[PDB]
Amino acid sequence: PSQVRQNYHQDAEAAINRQINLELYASYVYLSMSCYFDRDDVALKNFAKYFLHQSHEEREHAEKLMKLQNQRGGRIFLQDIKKPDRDDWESGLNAMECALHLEKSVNQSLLELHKLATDKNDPHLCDFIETYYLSEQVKSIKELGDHVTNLRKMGAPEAGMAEYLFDKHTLG
Amino acid sequence: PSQVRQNYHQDAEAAINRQINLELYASYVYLSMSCYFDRDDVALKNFAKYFLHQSHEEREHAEKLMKLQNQRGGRIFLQDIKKPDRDDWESGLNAMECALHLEKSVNQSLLELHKLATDKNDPHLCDFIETYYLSEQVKSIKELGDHVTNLRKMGAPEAGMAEYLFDKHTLG
Amino acid sequence: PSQVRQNYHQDAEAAINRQINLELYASYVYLSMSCYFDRDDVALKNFAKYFLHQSHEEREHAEKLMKLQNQRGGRIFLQDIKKPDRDDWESGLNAMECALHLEKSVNQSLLELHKLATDKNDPHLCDFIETYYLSEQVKSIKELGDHVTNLRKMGAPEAGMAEYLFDKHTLG
Amino acid sequence: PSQVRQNYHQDAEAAINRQINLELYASYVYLSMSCYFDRDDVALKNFAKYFLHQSHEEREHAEKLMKLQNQRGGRIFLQDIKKPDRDDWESGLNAMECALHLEKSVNQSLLELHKLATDKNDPHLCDFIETYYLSEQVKSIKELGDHVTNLRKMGAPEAGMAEYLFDKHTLG
Ligand SMILES: [Fe+3]
Ligand SMILES: [Zn+2]
Ligand SMILES: [Zn+2]
Ligand SMILES: [Zn+2]
Ligand SMILES: [Zn+2]
């Protein structure tokens, strides 16, 4: 094995590779969303900016897991990054709902990774996930839930000014 | 011919004179729009500011074509600047739709000028159009399309707050 | 069609979507390379930094094509991002040779896109490619060729100090 | 018991005392290494500086465990600090290999301490180890593995310039 490897289970290595792919997939979904709001028939620049930022953040998350894998003496194996489930995201409200679902899915994967690390008595990996991933996900989920709540109350998407004014006030 | 003239077709010279007139016409249309929004019964100051800026930009475009004509040793021949098609522009949404149409018309003229320059093997003129006109037009068209989309979604012109709030948030 | 669309062929739209995928693929290849040099048994930090920068640049290139597609009124359709051809890049010299090949492949695709835009009399798209893609690619190819030349002369990969000293002096 | 003591097992107290001794031992090993590279017949000043820094860091680690022991109401019991296994460390490469082994040994001890804290349901102690010790050790191990890899590739110790140039470029 690698000269640095210590207390690092093959299962954990495999699970980290899976998580890298999921974070890269999430980045790609956000990029798709960002583009949608940049269309001339949608034209919500602050929704576009918000989702592009999220795309860049999920990239960074993937890169930090790659750094971990090498720090522990595992080996990164990349897989195809699947295309997002859709090209047309329908509305600001629908995109925020889809983002909430995605973030909860990523959180579920991270909780399964923590359970594996706990089972394999790998405290460094448990601490890493907690320190850099789990509080970030809880914060993200709460922010997206707040956005969904506000858009729904305002009357989106049927009330035409709702997404416009949300774009200006909350996302601007 | 002029002592500076080289590789500059009489057709191209004539087409540049036509384009000068079209840019001056566009400036005048924008000025008309700007004034409309300054009326006491319309009273949308940021629409007025937006169209006055566009008027000044289209002037500048005309003046840059005049500079080109003299740089290449052509001769500027000015024509009457026709009055705009209307005095009353109806609404913020209607003015933005009319502006989009105008910008697409100007773009079409520039594409015809580029085709002529290409046919006449005039790379300096092709590059000039591309460098200073074609990307400017694509950007303008996309911005106006985004504005039209937003105003329509917000409910303009029948929803009375739509143009008011668009004036404040997007154009302010 | 889109309200902004003018002089934008369906073929060109499709070719831009293909190019977006190729740039995203290139970004992923560079990311794979970057990771490789971060392994404890490779341990060349400036090679890793160099390829991570290239990964981020190719992302940016993809995002600029997405912006173009929306500016012209085309519609972005994303596809799967295929995994790179390998996980183990063998040596600094081999990775630079593979990067040179990749950059030439991307250049070839851009030259085919320019030929299509020329055929379809789309000067804005021709100018865009030239302005933001073709000189960038020529510069990249020349830089990678210079790196390959230097590493080969120095004796890489068999001369053990060659990649070490190149990492320090050229990439540091 | 101490007036502050709460949820702090006698086993944990004993294990912390053991860890204090191990960190003091590691500091002493590093000091020995540092001195070696300061000899007139070895004369690698940046190797000497690197190991002296590591010596001072391992002191600090010991002192932080002493602070913990008193914060939790345990009592520090010091033991002899054994001399390092050798006086002559042979080469820069051999010292880095010996340091890697030592760091892995210290990590193993910390993982055993975390397992004990987990068994004894002592979350404050688990968190302390994770927060200040486990990520520090993973980082140290990866850095030493990278150094060993580079020195081996460069041809150390038989290639006479390898340690000289590594001292200048990596450690300088
Ligand atoms: Fe040197
Ligand atoms: Zn994430
Ligand atoms: Zn103009
Ligand atoms: Zn590129
Ligand atoms: Zn220590």
Author numbering:
A (entry chain K), B (entry chain O), C (entry chain A), D (entry chain B): 5 to 176
Article passage:
The Apollo (Direct Electron LP, San Diego, CA USA) is a new high-performance direct detector that addresses these challenges by using a novel event-based MAPS detector custom designed for ultra-fast electron counting. These results were extended by testing the performance of the camera for single particle cryo-EM by collecting data on two common test samples, the 481 kDa apoferritin and 149 kDa aldolase. Finally high-resolution apoferritin and aldolase datasets were collected and reconstructed to 1.66 Å and 2.24 Å respectively. Our results demonstrate that the Apollo camera performs well across a broad range of dose rates and is capable of capturing high quality data that produce high-resolution reconstructions for large and small single particle samples.
The expected indications of high resolution were present in the reconstruction including holes in 6 and 5 membered rings, the observation of numerous water molecules and ions and the beginnings of indications of hydrogens. There is a presumed Zn2+ atom chelated between Glu23, Glu58, and His61. The ice-optimized map had clear evidence of the Zn2+ atom, similar to other high resolution cryo-EM apoferritin reconstructions, whereas it was absent in the earlier 15 detected eps map. In addition to the differences in the Zn2+ density, there were differences in the water molecules surrounding the Zn2+ and the density for chelating residues Glu23, Glu58, and His61 became more well defined indicating that they are better stabilized in the presence of the ion. There are no other observable changes in the peptide backbone. These data indicate that there is a network of interactions between the Zn2+ ion, surrounding waters, and side chains that rearrange based on the presence and absence of the ion.
